[PDB]
Structure 1
Amino acid sequence: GFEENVVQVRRVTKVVKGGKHMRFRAIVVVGDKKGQVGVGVGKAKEVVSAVQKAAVDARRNIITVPMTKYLTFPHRNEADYGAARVMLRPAAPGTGVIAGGAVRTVLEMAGVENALGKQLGSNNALNNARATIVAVQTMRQFSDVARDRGIPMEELWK
């Protein structure tokens, strides 16, 4: 139970005999601001019903984002999703969230308050937003590296 925001709304058509069925395509991103990031797509004849379907589809797939004590990424990472490549790096405190439209919301709704990102591929919000999820799933904390490597955290800081 938490809030959501519409990332994009777009009308799609049909070429039936009599005319055209103009129905909406709603992309919705869901985030509690404390991890629990979700991306979903919905489609319906009405605007409101399309947002509801995307909300269920976004809540159908939720993933936590690794963050640090200062609400930043542990390290930089890139990802690709079709023709959509997205870039991410950590940032200093007080820097703020700066990124493209599709990338700002999914990070802004995640909880990270200080980071930066850039998209190097297509301008599609869907293909770019999903790339962010692929980017964050592949990142971890320093502790996860230590247990999977057999070296303490202080020894790696050197």
Structure 2
Amino acid sequence: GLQDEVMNIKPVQKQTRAGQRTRFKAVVVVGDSNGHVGLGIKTAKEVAGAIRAGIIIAKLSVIPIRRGYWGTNLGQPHSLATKTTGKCGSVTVRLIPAPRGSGIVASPAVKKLLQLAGVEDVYTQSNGKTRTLENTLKAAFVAIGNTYGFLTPNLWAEQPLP
């Protein structure tokens, strides 16, 4: 089921005549919890506009992930596949699958990517600068997925000819 969960805003000050106006740069993470996530950021005048702008554009940039059973475990049960590192600016996000019962251990940016992907038991690490709007979230989205980042290892054999 599609869950919209809001991360944060910054109040973006623009200098204009007589005084400043505001604009809001909103971050909303979409996900299914079965095995899809969604990245969306856009701006607007008000907070009420910016949230809706981040909601809709996240449903374009939908990423499948290999988690869960189809029949047999084609995705890893309640965890990520392998480990993946990924840079995006002066920012790195690193990942590791955990055993079951651990729960979702992560930074508050990457946490709502993982739980809305359905990924329960993981440890998650960032290093360096953490710039939450842009860099860590972009880095985590290119690290977590199937189209980006992870491969399972079944699809690795399916793609060549046996």
TM-score, normalised with respect to structure 1: 0.88
What letter matches 2:89 in structure 1?
G
Deviates more, 1:104-113 or 1:59-68: 59-68
- 1:93-149 CA-to-partner distances (Å, cap 9, x unmatched) read 111110101011111111001111111132211210111111122211121122346
Unaligned runs of 5+ in 2: 68-74
CA RMSD after TM alignment: 1.6
Q: Secondary structure at the match of 1:130?
A: helix
Q: 1:127 aligns with which of 124, 129, 135?
A: 135
Could you tell me which residue of structure 2 aligns to residue 87 of structure 1? Answer: 94
Unaligned runs of 5+ in 1: 152-158
Bigger radius of gyration: 1
Give the share of equivalent positions with the same residue, in percent.
30
Could you tell me which residue of structure 1 aligns to residue 155 of structure 2? Answer: 144
What are the equivalent positions in structure 2 for 1:25-104 lying under 5 Å apart? 25-67=25-67, 68-104=75-111
What letter matches 1:73 in structure 2?
L
In 1: Cα distance, 2:76 partner to 2:142 partner: 22
Could you tell me which residue of structure 2 aligns to residue 156 of structure 1? Answer: none
Native 8 Å contact 1:80 1:134 kept in 2? no
What letter matches 2:152 in structure 1?
Q
Q: Give the number of aligned pairs.
A: 151
In 2: Cα distance, 1:37 partner to 1:112 partner: 11
